[PDB]
Amino acid sequence: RALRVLVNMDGVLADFEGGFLRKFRARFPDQPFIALEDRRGFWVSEQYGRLRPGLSEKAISIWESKNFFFELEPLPGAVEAVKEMASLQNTDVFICTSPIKMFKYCPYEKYAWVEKYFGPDFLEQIVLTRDKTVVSADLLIDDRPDITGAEPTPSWEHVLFTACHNQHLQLQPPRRRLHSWADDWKAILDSKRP
Amino acid sequence: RALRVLVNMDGVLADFEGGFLRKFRARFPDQPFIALEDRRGFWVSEQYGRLRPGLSEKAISIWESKNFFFELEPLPGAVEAVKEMASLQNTDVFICTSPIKMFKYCPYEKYAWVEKYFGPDFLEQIVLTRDKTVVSADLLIDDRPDITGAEPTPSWEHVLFTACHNQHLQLQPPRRRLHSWADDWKAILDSKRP
Ligand SMILES: Cc1cn([C@H]2C[C@H](OP(=O)(O)O)[C@@H](CO)O2)c(=O)[nH]c1=O
Ligand SMILES: Cc1cn([C@H]2C[C@H](OP(=O)(O)O)[C@@H](CO)O2)c(=O)[nH]c1=O
Ligand SMILES: [Mg+2]
Ligand SMILES: [Mg+2]
């Protein structure tokens, strides 16, 4: 009876693209880079690899480094919106996020980041998983276009959160976007209420 | 169409009770302890607290310490059974586990432990969550008696994995047990197949 909304972390709450670019340029100042306006495709490393050999690996080294995830800036309006959303009657919010493959820092720092911006109690709302299709909900707000896994018919509707890497993408008609946290997320939630 | 089984970690794959007792006695040799045969109730700290003041906090300090989760021994038959289970046709296995509240080590070490016993590829199967009711599956094999959360009608059947803390518990009749990994887990899976 409560509406259940999964909110993705990187690309939705936390500015992974901006953080990556800043730290990449700082560490590899003699290398070429991709301006955010020129990003295409979800995987940063794939575009960097196309741009010259060995650059994929240098890109990966940025997000595998300590404090990369912890130091990400929140996207504008994201913390306020999620706080408001969680406080709504008949509304349960989980943060549903995937770790990178190297697990030394990323799990820990994602929990740390949520504590920082949402408080200790909000840690109870974190679902860390590589497969979001096995998490049941009414809505998943996520910047990644292709959300696949072991469940062929997830219970949620995937609402595509706009990011630099996806802003030009034409989606299969029934599919919907949340263009930013200034956009009308309440109306999206309301369209799903019983 | 594939059967989906969530397998819990502590108390099912990893021997949290035995590990705790060993390290508690080593660190607090002048304190009284609870032999595994005398354990009752899921929460170790609650029973320790009843046994004398301040002992709850000393207990908690054991599992909050570095390497506690990483150094847990697998339960007999657990690694072999899960490997066999995951290899079965039409059978998807996820490891569904909750972190403790202090997140400095536990997330990381649980991933590390799964890598150690199941290999890098099995990391894709981990779901870290405080709420298992929002994870959809056919079966949840879990030593904790009370599995609650935001979903009042989970999709899985909870099969109670026997542990020292629950072995005397009378369950509400429809509820089922897996008494150990030597017990016939294949038959349990089969009862759920379409
Ligand atoms: C490699 C890579 C990871 N990520 C993020 C997304 C996942 O986090 P999240 O699920 O919070 O969006 C995590 C693992 O892929 O890292 C990107 O956002 N872009 C990338 O290019
Ligand atoms: C405090 C406590 C935690 N745990 C485990 C269970 C959870 O792991 P798991 O979900 O893998 O069983 C984790 C957080 O409570 O620590 C016990 O098994 N016994 C306890 O007394
Ligand atoms: Mg994302
Ligand atoms: Mg357990």
From Swiss-Prot, chains A, B:
GO molecular function: 5'-nucleotidase activity; metal ion binding; nucleotidase activity; nucleotide binding
Keywords assigned by UniProt, alphabetized: Hydrolase, Magnesium, Metal-binding, Mitochondrion, Nucleotide metabolism, Nucleotide-binding, Transit peptide
Binding site for substrate: 10, 16, 42-44, 63, 97, 132
Location(s), subcellular: Mitochondrion
A family per Pfam: NT5C
Broad EC category: hydrolase
Cofactor(s) needed by this chain: Mg(2+)
Active site: 8, 10
InterPro entries reported in the protein's UniProt record: 5'(3')-deoxyribonucleotidase, HAD-like_sf, HAD_sf
CDD domains xref list: HAD_5-3dNT
E.C. designation(s): 3.1.3.-
Predominant localisation class: mitochondrion
Highest taxon above the source species: Eukaryota
Biological process according to GO: DNA replication; dUMP catabolic process; pyrimidine deoxyribonucleotide catabolic process
Tagged with keyword Mitochondrion: yes
Cellular component GO terms held in the UniProt record: mitochondrial matrix; mitochondrion
Tissue: Highly expressed in heart, brain and skeletal muscle. Detected at very low levels in kidney and pancreas.
Sites where the protein binds Mg(2+): 8, 10, 143
Free-text function comment from the UniProt entry: Dephosphorylates specifically the 5' and 2'(3')-phosphates of uracil and thymine deoxyribonucleotides, and so protects mitochondrial DNA replication from excess dTTP. Has only marginal activity towards dIMP and dGMP.
Family that this chain belongs to: Belongs to the 5'(3')-deoxyribonucleotidase family.
Subunit structure: Homodimer.
Protein name: 5'(3')-deoxyribonucleotidase, mitochondrial
Provenance organism: Homo sapiens (Human)
